[PDB]
Design a protein around this nucleic acid. Sequence first.
RNA 1: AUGAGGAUAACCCA
RNA 2: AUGAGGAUAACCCA
RNA 3: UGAGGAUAACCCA
RNA 4: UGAGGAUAACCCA
Lengths: 129, 129, 129, 129, 129, 129
Amino acid sequence: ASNFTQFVLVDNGGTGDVTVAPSNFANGVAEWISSNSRSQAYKVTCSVRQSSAQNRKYTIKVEVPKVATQTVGGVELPVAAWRSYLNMELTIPIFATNSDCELIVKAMQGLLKDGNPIPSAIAANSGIY
Amino acid sequence: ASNFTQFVLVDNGGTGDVTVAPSNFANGVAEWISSNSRSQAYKVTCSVRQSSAQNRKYTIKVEVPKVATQTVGGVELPVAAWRSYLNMELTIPIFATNSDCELIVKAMQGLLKDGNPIPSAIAANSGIY
Amino acid sequence: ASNFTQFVLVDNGGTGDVTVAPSNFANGVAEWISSNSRSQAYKVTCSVRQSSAQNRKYTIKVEVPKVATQTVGGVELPVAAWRSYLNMELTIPIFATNSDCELIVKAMQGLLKDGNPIPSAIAANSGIY
Amino acid sequence: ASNFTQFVLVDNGGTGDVTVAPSNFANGVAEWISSNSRSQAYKVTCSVRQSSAQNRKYTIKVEVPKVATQTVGGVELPVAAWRSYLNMELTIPIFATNSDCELIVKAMQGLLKDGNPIPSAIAANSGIY
Amino acid sequence: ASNFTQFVLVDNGGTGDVTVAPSNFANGVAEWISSNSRSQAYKVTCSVRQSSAQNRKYTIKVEVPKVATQTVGGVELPVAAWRSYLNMELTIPIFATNSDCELIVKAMQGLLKDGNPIPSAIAANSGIY
Amino acid sequence: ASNFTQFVLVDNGGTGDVTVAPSNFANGVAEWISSNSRSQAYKVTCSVRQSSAQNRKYTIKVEVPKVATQTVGGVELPVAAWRSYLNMELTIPIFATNSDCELIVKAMQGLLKDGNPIPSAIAANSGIY
RNA sequence: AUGAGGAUAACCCA
RNA sequence: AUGAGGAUAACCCA
RNA sequence: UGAGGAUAACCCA
RNA sequence: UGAGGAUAACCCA
C-alpha cells in the first residue's frame, strides 16, 4: 500500500481526462499536479494535523486553471488567465471510528452528486432558491 | 427552476439512506437538515456572494454526526466529541462560464470519488503515505 | 528494500493479534496505527536525525490503549485515563557499524524478553524489589 | 520472589552472551552492570515514580559500550571508545489492570521483534521508507 | 507512489556498488545515506523551492568520503580521511513543461557522459586544455 | 592532446542532437556554445582553481534556452523566452588520486542516471515524495 | 508538565 | 481558536 | 549575485 | 558559508 498515488481529477470518459500525479511531500503537505508547465497545472494539496487535543483537521485545496497563451514582451508564454480555488477544512473528533469516517466521506460525495442542489447552482452560476 | 429541494446526502443503496430537507432560508443562507434533534442531525448550509470585484464565493458547510455508540435522541456531551465539521469555500473568477463551472464541479467530484487518495485517507483515519 | 510496511505489534498466537499499518509519513515521521478510532488505537511513530556532529538519534513513540472495561468506538474521557505512552530515544555515535547496531538492537530485545526483571515489573504494576 | 535479578541483556546463544547483574539500588534507582571495569560495563537502570495524581512513570536507561584499550600517559587503560544510550519513559495510568499492562509489554516486544520495520532500520543504519 | 527510495549511487558492475537509502526528510530536505558507519557514509540531499515568482530551484548535494581508519591512543575509529563535495543548483522557470524538463535532464546527463571534456578533466585531476 | 573540444550536450538519437563547440578560454574559464544565434544558444563553462591549501574546486555551468521568436514593431528577432540554469561546484582534496576522481565522477553519473529519484523528480516538475 | 531539544548520561536547556 | 473575512493561494487580516 | 571559503542545508562580500 | 536571489564568471547577508 501507499495512498499517495495519481488519480483522475476531471473525468471526460478517458479523453481530455485531467489526471493528477504525486509531485511533492515537502513539509508534510502532499501535492499533486497535472502534466503541465507549473504555470498552467491543476494543483491539489492535502495535509492532516492534530489541530487540538481531541481533533484532527484535514486541509485540502484544489486549483482549477483557465489555460491561455500570453504575449509578454512580444514572446509567447503558457499561462493561466485565472484560477478557481477550492478550500476545504474537515475537523474530525479523535473518537470517530472508521465506520464514522466512511459516513463523512459518503456525505461529501452525495453533497456533490450530479443533479443535487449545490452542484446544480454552482454549474448554473446561480444561488439556491 | 427552484433548486432548494431535499436530497440524499448519505446513500446506502435505498436502505438506510440519509435524506436532508430544506429547513431554513434566513439571510439567503439555505439550510437543510435530517430528521433528528439538532444535536444529532446532518446539517448542510450554502451561500454565494461577490467576495470582491474579481470573484464570487460559495461557502458550503456540512455537519456530520458521530454514529458509533450513539444514543438516539439522548443528551451527548461534550458536543465537539460527537460531530465532524466540513467547511468548503469555492472561489470562482467572474469570467467563468457555465462550462468553466461544470468543469470545476467535475474536479470536486473527482477529488472525492471512491478509491481515490483523499477519500481513502479520510475513511481510514489516515494521512498520506 | 522498503521497510515501511505493516507488522504485528501485539502477538496473541494468531488469534486476536493486533496489526499496525502505515498511516502517515508527514515530515519524515513514519506512522502506523491499528484499525480503530484514533482515541482507541495502537499508534507507533519513528524518526531519525543527526542530533549532533557526533550522534544520530532515533525517536520512537508508542501509544497503547487501556482495554479493560473499554467500550469499542465510544467516547471515553478523560483521555489520559485510557492511554499509556511509551517514549524511546536511541542515541547512536556516528562510528557504529551495521554490526555495532545489530548488537544494540539485541540489547533492546533482551531488556524486554519475557521473564526478565523490567518487563515482569511492568506487567505486574510493580517496581523493583 | 524479588525481581531484582541478573539476566541476559545480549544473547549470542550462551557464548559471548552479555549478562547483567544487580549492582545498586541507592536512591530508588535499580542498577545492573556487566562483569567489567566500571569504565567498560554495560549499564541498565530503572525507576518508577508516581509522576502525577493518576500516572506512574517508569524511566529505563541502557548504555551499550564500544570497548577499547587506550594509552593515556604511555599506560594502557580499559576504556570505552563511545557509548550508545537508550532512554525510555513509559507513562501508565493508575487505572490500568494487570492484563492492560501485559498488553503494553507485548507491544514493546513486538515493536522490536526481528524482521519488523523499526529494528531493521536501526540495524541497517537507515530510516523508514 | 514514491520517489524517495533507495538507489545505486556508484555502479561497479554488480559488486562494489554503492547504494544510498532514505534516511530523513525534514523541513523539505530529502536525505539519502549509504549503510554502515555514518562517519564513512556517502550522503545525498535534495530540495526544491519557489525561489521567486517565476522560478523554482533545486539544490542537490553529494558527499564522497575517503574511507580510512583513525588511530589515537591505540583506539581506532572508522572515519573519513576527507570528503569530496558536489554542490548543484538548478533553476527552472515555471513556464517549463515536462518536455522541457526532460531536455534539461538530458543536458545534465550529456555534460557528464563518459569521454566528454568535463567528466574526463575531473577524472584525471585536470582542467581544460 | 586537447580536451577543449566539441561534444554532444543533448543526445536525441542521431538527429535532434545538440552539439556544443569551443568558443573561448579567457582567464581560466573554458566556454562552449552551440551553433547559430548566440541569443538562442546553449552555453557551458568550466574552470578549476586552488580554492585553498588542500582543495581544488571546479565550477561548471550550463544554460538551457527555450528557443522562441520575439516580435516588436513587426520586427522579429531570434531570442530565448527564458533560460534554465545549472550551476555546480565540485571540491576535491589534493590527496585524491586518479582512482578517487574516477569514483567521484561515477557518483555524479549515478546521481543523474535515468530512473533514479533526482533525475525523475526534475523531469516531472516534481520534488521528493 | 511538554519538546522528532542537547549530552560527555539518574544530568542540562526552553 | 472563530469569521456566509480577503487573496494574487501551504498566505494575510480581525 | 559571486570561476567567494568551508570542517557542508553553514559562513563571508 | 548560505535548501541566499538573479536578467548568470554577477549580486546580497
